[PDB]
Design a protein around this ligand. Sequence first.
Ligand SMILES: CCC[C@@H]1C[C@@H](C(=O)N[C@@H]([C@H]2O[C@H](SC)[C@H](O)[C@@H](O)[C@H]2O)[C@@H](C)O)N(C)C1
Ligand SMILES: CCC[C@@H]1C[C@@H](C(=O)N[C@@H]([C@H]2O[C@H](SC)[C@H](O)[C@@H](O)[C@H]2O)[C@@H](C)O)N(C)C1
Ligand SMILES: [Cl-]
Ligand SMILES: [Mg+2]
Ligand SMILES: [Mg+2]
Ligand SMILES: [Mg+2]
Ligand SMILES: [Mg+2]
Lengths: 158, 158
Amino acid sequence: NNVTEKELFYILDLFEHMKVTYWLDGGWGVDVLTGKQQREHRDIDIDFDAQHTQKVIQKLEDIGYKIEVHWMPSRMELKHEEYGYLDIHPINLNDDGSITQANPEGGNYVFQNDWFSETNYKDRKIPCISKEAQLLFHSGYDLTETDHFDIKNLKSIT
Amino acid sequence: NNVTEKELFYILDLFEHMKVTYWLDGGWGVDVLTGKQQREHRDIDIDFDAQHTQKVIQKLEDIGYKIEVHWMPSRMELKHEEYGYLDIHPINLNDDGSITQANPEGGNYVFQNDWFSETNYKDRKIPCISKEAQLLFHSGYDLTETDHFDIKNLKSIT
Ligand SMILES: CCC[C@@H]1C[C@@H](C(=O)N[C@@H]([C@H]2O[C@H](SC)[C@H](O)[C@@H](O)[C@H]2O)[C@@H](C)O)N(C)C1
Ligand SMILES: CCC[C@@H]1C[C@@H](C(=O)N[C@@H]([C@H]2O[C@H](SC)[C@H](O)[C@@H](O)[C@H]2O)[C@@H](C)O)N(C)C1
Ligand SMILES: [Cl-]
Ligand SMILES: [Mg+2]
Ligand SMILES: [Mg+2]
Ligand SMILES: [Mg+2]
Ligand SMILES: [Mg+2]
């Protein structure tokens, strides 16, 4: 049921084939920063260009993902019988160079651009959020045992 | 108004003369990691060995700090007419090797040992929380402009 490296690569291929700018986030994002798989994963988190929201959802449905949680335009969780869980997060990629997310209520989060980057993982280049961003969006007073493991793995990155 | 480097050192000295294990935290903790002062600070945050809570409070009171809000177990917020604001956070250095802080809603927060570090600041060794711990206890979705400034100062750390 867990999301294997091969299944992650397939999802990465989907977005790249669709020419949708995106970055891997969450737990697989942590492992990718370390250069190898560290643990089993329930899910993949992908942050993606919000202008392609409709065709991203449609393609995921087309290959068998079922929508289970729809918190859009903030977040959506889908589930595939083989590929596992996938959470997508639409983000706004503005012509003025800025990268934003709508504030669930009022306003816009303005991300730091260098929080979105790329790493060479087993000689594939994978766009992903940075180690710094991973630590920033983790919450120190709200950590699971698995969060603790991931944070230690980030620390081991030279 | 603020808390100067000289004032900071004197508060650090109090803990050292009391022989209480402690770590500098908060904004001054960020500056110390970088090795020089970066901005004016309204307060000091110090995490310290909870076994010494009673004598630590007594000494702060003896030199003239007044308790503003008593939030045990999390912390005590204090204020001094000349030295300004000081928050202290009692942490438990357990014989099982864990480091924890009580959570008023049940259980405890678990910290990692390597979040408690030190650095050479102007040829003084100051114990302080780590760079990664500072990022971790910041909240990505709730950063002020000063938080961003503080965080970028940690980038610059070669
Ligand atoms: C540099 C930008 C990083 C941002 C962080 C990411 C995000 O929102 N993650 C959520 C996650 O909450 C839970 S994990 C605890 C969810 O399980 C997970 O799917 C996911 O939503 C939370 C940690 O902030 N954002 C879109 C972009
Ligand atoms: C390493 C584990 C120890 C815990 C971590 C620490 C913590 O939360 N510090 C925050 C502080 O952010 C602001 S200061 C800039 C807050 O004002 C301050 O209260 C304070 O939370 C960190 C970002 O500097 N805790 C009390 C104990
Ligand atoms: Cl630990
Ligand atoms: Mg994930
Ligand atoms: Mg997730
Ligand atoms: Mg502070
Ligand atoms: Mg503070």
